[PDB]
Structure formats: structure tokens, C-alpha cells
Amino acid sequence: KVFGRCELAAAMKRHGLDNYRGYSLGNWVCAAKFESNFNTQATNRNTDGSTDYGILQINSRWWCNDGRTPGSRNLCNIPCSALLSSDITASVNCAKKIVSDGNGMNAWVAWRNRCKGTDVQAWIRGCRL
């Protein structure tokens, strides 16, 4: 599923991501945008063999289990395939855990290089929230 910009914002808020750990909704969306371009089915392989899944490109090294990432963890306790679902609940609960891990949203390289310090608010401009 490819979400609409305003559509994902709504979903993200309903699931309490809006301002979770102090990160405004617009930050979360800017992330989704650059991590997956709003497509719940996005997968991207990393050189180290781990794999990024979902709207937030959650990694198999620590957060989910794909059964193919030698010596990794599954800290969110979920098959990485739950992160490719049309319902974003799982991605959202795993992100809450990820973002609370000490480094905040830097955990998402794309957010740091493309969202951090930008007018993230633009991402929700217009949305009926």
C-alpha cells in the first residue's frame, strides 16, 4: 500500500506517533517519505546482509526477524513481514521502541540527512488533523 501524505499523517497520529519522544508528526512523515516513499511494501538490502523493511525501513539486525540475518536480534519481537503490512500498527510500535533507544530519530539515517532541521511541518501542511 502506498499512502497519501495526509493519509499517512492521520494513521500515524491515531497510533500515537504524533510527538512521541518529542518528535512532531511532520518529522515522522518526512521520514516515511524518504525511507519508503510511503510504500508499506518497501524492502531495501544492506551491504551487511541485513534488510530494511516497511514504511520506516526497520532493520533486521535488531528490530525484526527475517530468519536470514546471521547473529541479529528481533527486539520488536515480530517477523519482518509484519512490517510490510497495509496496516501500519506494527511498524509504528517498533518505531516507538527504536526511537526510544537513546539516539532518537537519528536511528533513521535518511531522517538525519534529509529531515533533521528542515521545515518538517510542511509535511502536514493542509492535512485535516
Q: Binding site annotation covers 66?
A: no
69 scored as a contact of Cl ion (CB under 5 A): yes
Residue 25: how many CB atoms within 10 A of its CB? 22
Query: Least CB distance from residue 20 to Au ion, whole Å?
Result: 14
Q: Residue 73 is which amino acid?
A: R
Q: Which stretch binds Au ion (CB under 5 A): 21-29, 64-72, 78-86, 88-96?
A: 88-96
State the catalytic residues.
Answer: 35, 52
11 scored as a contact of Au ion (CB under 5 A): yes
- DSSP states along 21-72: GG--HHHHHHHHHHHHTTBTT-EEE-TTS-EEETTTTEETTTT-B-S-STT-
56 scored as a contact of Au ion (CB under 5 A): no
Known binding residues for substrate are 101
